[PDB]
Design a protein around this nucleic acid. Structure first.
Lengths: 124, 205, 233
RNA sequence: ACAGGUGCUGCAUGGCUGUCGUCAGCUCGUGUCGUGAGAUGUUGGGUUAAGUCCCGCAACGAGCGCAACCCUUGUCCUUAGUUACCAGGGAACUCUAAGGAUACUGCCAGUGACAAACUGGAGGAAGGCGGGGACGACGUCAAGUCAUCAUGGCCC
């Protein structure tokens, strides 16, 4: 029952990895039902298939906050944090894939005088 | 004009508000309006004495105003005769009786307001601005300090074209947040117009 | 040890000058000749100039006077350092800062800063400092000491200055004339011999010759120190 | 007596603001050079986001600027667990919000004046200023504001 905490721009994902058949349940619902995005599905299942063990561990993910692709990144980061628990020899491969780094990217705040984070009110 | 107030930009890092009361948003406004009214009155009725910092923390009901003057003897008077008549007056325009205590200024030369008021008084009394500005620099450095900057703006010398003259001695690093800089901007209502007096007193990081 | 002989000067090569093109016409009197297009210094005038010179520092060493050793050329970089500490006298070997003497009032702080960094490094004040920050203070001390190594214990202006290769140390000569403190210098046959009270015509480029001059000054100033201690009892 | 005046003058002013421009500059003390205005420092070799840093150098130092101290985000630890949470009532986790840890060109390989620095590599959540903000030097524009306010003069 290895535990990993996944985080992305505004979504926090908690994963409970355990050896099993390979079923993935997110928020008490199947991954395919929860994620209508094929991109999000692939991002969630990417670390498992990266090291050649998709159908080896049973997942129980509980996501909160963020959006539909931020949650996918949070789940991927949490799954990485959980895989590094059972074995420390996978950490090199996951780091080389770039899944161990938590993306610090965030919505840059709107600035006064500006129309957005950077957009300016055109002059002439 | 492009310089932030050096007291407000330091309000959280190395300074403290001269107000320490919590009020509800409904009640916040009337406290502050009442709080500001105390400051204007106390700055005129107590003008003879040299007062620099007036901290107004009001506990539940009461209000513990803490003035920091350099002449407690004339604020207090004979056996506190003058402080008591002020006690019954501040309460009249405030809520329940509020106690007033006086803090002592060991060195009345490191406070920007006290230095600025002296320069403001001298300009009122037909004193050449060059000597008034230079002397206050000398007194502050000789009184123990690490930097003084005093700036006089207006019709200096009664001229028709105003100009800014400032004499800095020391460090006074305004861009350092942990600087402990005392700032004051007072005025001098001369016969030829208002003269602005700004004083910076750097007293160690 | 007040009279240097003529023989060792010839052995150390104190007669070889410079090319017959770079010479100063004011250097003319005491030049023996010009062989193979090189000016030869007349040693008779050199040895007489030393004898007056070593007789000058001897009187100063008997009066607890302080003479400054100046030399920053490669041939006189290190030798000034060891001979000065043998004599317990100030020296400058890295570079003569512009204003070491005329602007001596300003250099007080730099020496005072250097002394402060030494006192805090004796008891040990690096515990309160970080790994990099201590090295930052350490690197400042070595740089501040490299320039001011001999004059840190000078405490006021010297009353005599010993310069080698007067042409090289022209700034020191101009400062000395400004302040009036006598200078005992070594002039090659290309340099300006003026503003130098005790002239020493000699070769200032040979490693052996330079050491011979500075050491001969060192034993002389040491000898006067010994004679000064004969009046204690 | 007066009060009152959003009546005039921002080209009589204070206070506040824009702007060049978050550009990397702007000066001073002493010393030295010049009859002098002035110069040097502040230039030159590199280097940097930076007058940043090192080395040279009649300069030696300093001040305001740059950087840092501040806020927020990025990982982890500690105290705490309701009105927050839910792995097995629980005190795990997420979250919440106070105090801290880490990051320092610290380590490696090279170039580089035996330098500052630069180029890549490991570890780590983060690598070289990690991302964003606040902070706006001396001064410039007789810039804007007498209608936030105060204020000299003029006027009702």
């Amino acid at each position: 029952r290895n535990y990993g905490t996944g985080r992305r721009k505004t979504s926090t994902a908690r994963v409970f990895l355990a050896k099993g058949t390979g079923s993935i349940v997110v928020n008490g619902k199947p991954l395919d039902e929860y994620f209508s995005r094929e991109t999000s599905r692939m991002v969630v299942r990417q670390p498992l298939e990266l090291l050649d063990s998709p159908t080896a561990y049973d997942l129980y993910i509980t996501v909160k906050g963020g959006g539909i692709s931020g949650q996918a990144g949070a789940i991927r980061h949490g799954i990485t944090r959980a895989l590094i628990e059972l074995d420390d020899t996978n950490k090199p491969a996951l780091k080389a894939a770039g899944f161990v780094t938590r993306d610090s990217r965030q919505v840059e705040r709107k600035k006064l005088g500006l129309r957005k984070a950077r957009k300016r009110p055109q002059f002439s | 004009g492009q310089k932030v107030h050096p007291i407000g930009i330091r309000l959280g890092v190395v300074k403290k508000h001269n107000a320490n009361w919590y009020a509800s948003p409904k009640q916040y406004s009337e406290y502050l309006i009442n709080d500001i009214q105390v400051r204007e009155y106390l700055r005129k009725k107590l003008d003879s004495a040299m007062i620099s910092n007036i901290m107004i923390e009001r506990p539940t009901g009461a209000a513990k105003i803490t003035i920091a003057t350099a002449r407690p003897g004339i604020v207090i008077g004979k056996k506190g005769e003058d402080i008591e008549r002020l006690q019954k007056e501040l309460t009249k325009m405030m809520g329940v009786p509020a106690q007033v205590n006086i803090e002592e200024i060991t060195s009345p030369d490191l406070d920007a307001r006290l230095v600025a008021d002296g320069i403001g008084s001298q300009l009122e009394r037909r004193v050449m601005f060059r000597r008034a500005m230079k002397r206050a620099v000398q007194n502050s450095m000789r009184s123990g300090a690490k930097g003084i900057k005093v700036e006089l703006s207006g019709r200096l010398g009664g001229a028709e074209i105003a100009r800014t003259e400032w004499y800095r001695e020391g460090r006074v690093p305004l861009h350092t947040l942990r600087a402990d800089i005392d700032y004051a901007s007072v005025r001098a209502e001369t016969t030829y117009g208002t003269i602005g007096v700004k004083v910076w007193i750097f007293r160690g990081e | 040890p007040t009279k240097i002989e003529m023989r060792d000067l010839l052995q150390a090569g104190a007669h070889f000058g410079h090319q017959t093109r770079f010479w100063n016409p004011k250097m003319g009197p005491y030049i023996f000749g010009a062989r193979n297009k090189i000016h030869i210094i007349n040693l008779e005038h050199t040895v007489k100039a030393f004898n007056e010179a070593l007789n000058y520092v001897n009187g100063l060493a008997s009066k607890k006077n302080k003479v400054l050793f100046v030399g920053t050329k490669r041939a006189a970089s290190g030798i000034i350092a060891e001979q000065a500490t043998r004599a317990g006298m100030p020296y400058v070997d890295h570079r003569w800062l512009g204003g070491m003497l005329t602007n001596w009032k300003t250099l007080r702080q730099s020496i005072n800063r250097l002394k402060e960094l030494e006192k805090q490094a004796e008891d040990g004040t690096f515990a309160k400092l970080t790994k990099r920050e201590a090295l930052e203070r350490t690197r400042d001390m070595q740089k501040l000491e490299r320039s001011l190594g001999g004059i840190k214990d000078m405490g006021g202006l010297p009353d005599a200055i010993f310069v080698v290769d007067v042409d090289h140390e022209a700034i020191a000569i101009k400062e000395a004339k400004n302040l009036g403190i006598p200078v005992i210098g070594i002039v090659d046959t290309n340099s300006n011999p003026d503003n130098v009270d005790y002239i020493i015509p000699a070769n200032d480029d040979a490693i052996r010759a330079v050491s011979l001059y500075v050491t001969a000054m060192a034993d002389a100033i040491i000898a006067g120190k010994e004679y000064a201690q004969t009046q204690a009892s």
